[PDB]
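Annual report, structural modelling task.

Input specification for the N-hexanoyl-L-homocysteine complex:
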Amino acid sequence: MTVKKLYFIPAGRCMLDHSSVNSALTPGKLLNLPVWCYLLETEEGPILVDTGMPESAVNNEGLFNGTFVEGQILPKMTEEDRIVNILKRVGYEPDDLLYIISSHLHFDHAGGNGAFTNTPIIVQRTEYEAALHREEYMKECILPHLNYKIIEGDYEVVPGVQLLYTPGHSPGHQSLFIETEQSGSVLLTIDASYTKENFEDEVPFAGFDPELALSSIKRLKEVVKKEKPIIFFGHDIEQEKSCRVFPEYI
Ligand SMILES: CCCCCC(=O)N[C@@H](CCS)C(=O)O
Ligand SMILES: [Zn+2]
Ligand SMILES: [Zn+2]
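The model returned the following structure:
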């Protein structure tokens, strides 16, 4: 086996229109949503899940001016939220990590990937291929010479750390099913559901293929029925109220 510690580590924030968390809502109210990374302390070494936002977002809420998402996505990132600075404060440098796991290559999950030039970065083949051409991918999230460990489908990273292929929000989105010493089974949906209501109630939210995202939610509900994990959503302002966060762990 089990992971020794699972840390939730705030990595900045992002404003998103509320129509991105519930596709039925009337656009025009932004929500200041959390961006997370996760650090797993395992017998084999530390594994980082996602890497925050790119340096171009630092003190630059207008990063997406002049793009298809102008006014709809505004990163809220300071110098402290750079993943190398986060990791140094927690006690690590990039080359200390055993693996990086990219849930997907959207900007607030892979914007720090370039900091890791030796650590294998585990990413789904269908996400890597999408990032090579789809417009919602920033160049910082698909740098060409990193040590990618491309995978296809479900995958065991080390004992206690399983990747569940959950496409739809993005073409190769993957969620995590972790077994921890303190808590037992934990499901990190990541962006397979931004919020509890996207998951439980199947409220539609932003995604590349909403129908496929719904089938991935149904698949995760089969896993939930079998494993009864505690479940954490990708950008849920209500749940963030009660999350244990670094230096606490689960
Ligand atoms: C196609 C679905 C969305 C692409 C735009 C995008 O990168 N949105 C963010 C939301 C940050 S609060 C994400 O998915 O993590
Ligand atoms: Zn995403
Ligand atoms: Zn996200």
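The first strand starts at residue 5 and ends at 17.
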